Design a binder for this molecule. Structure first.
Ligand SMILES: *[C@@H]1O[C@H](CO)[C@@H](O)[C@H](O)[C@H]1NC(C)=O
Lengths: 50, 49, 50
């Protein structure tokens, strides 16, 4: 604890995400919505807006 | 757990000691790095080994 | 107002020992990169301390 400010311990957690690789397994908090067809809407498929 | 001098080495496209011999990150990294001080948790007056 | 300048020349400069000498955070540069300083080399070095 006597040592300098540049030599203090630092806990590091590194999060890595893989995307656009597989059907999604972990996803964030967002409620679902019933599907309609033959009408242009604002869709959202696992984070793909359009 | 690392020291304060090598927090900048945890990044894509960096060399050194931690970044080249211990923990190397890829160039196409898509993620987030969280680092915080732990002087009240991982420090001892007799030294840590 | 009376900053000291030291002319570093005629020697082999190792920049990996700077982190052990002083407990600083960032080796902030403007023309070069910190990780590439052991590969290429210069004519003269000037160290200004205050
Ligand atoms: C700085 O120099 C003093 C005097 O020789 C020495 O006792 C001390 O260990 C040195 N510190 C570092 C970090 O080199």
């Amino acid at each position: 604890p006597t040592y300098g400010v540049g030599h203090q311990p630092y806990r590091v957690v590194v999060l890595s995400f893989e995307l656009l690789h597989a059907p999604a397994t972990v996803c964030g908090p967002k409620k679902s919505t019933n599907l309609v067809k033959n009408k242009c809407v604002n869709f959202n498929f696992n984070g793909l807006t359009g | 757990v690392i020291r304060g001098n090598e927090v900048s080495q945890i990044a894509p496209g960096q060399t050194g000691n931690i970044a080249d011999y211990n923990y190397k990150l890829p160039d196409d990294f898509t993620g987030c790095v969280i680092a915080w001080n732990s002087n009240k948790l991982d420090s001892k007056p007799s030294g840590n080994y | 107002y009376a900053w000291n300048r030291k002319r570093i020349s005629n020697c082999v400069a190792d920049y990996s020992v700077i982190y052990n000498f002083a407990p600083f955070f960032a080796f902030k540069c403007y023309g070069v990169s910190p990780t590439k300083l052991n590969d290429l080399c210069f004519t003269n070095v000037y160290a200004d301390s205050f």
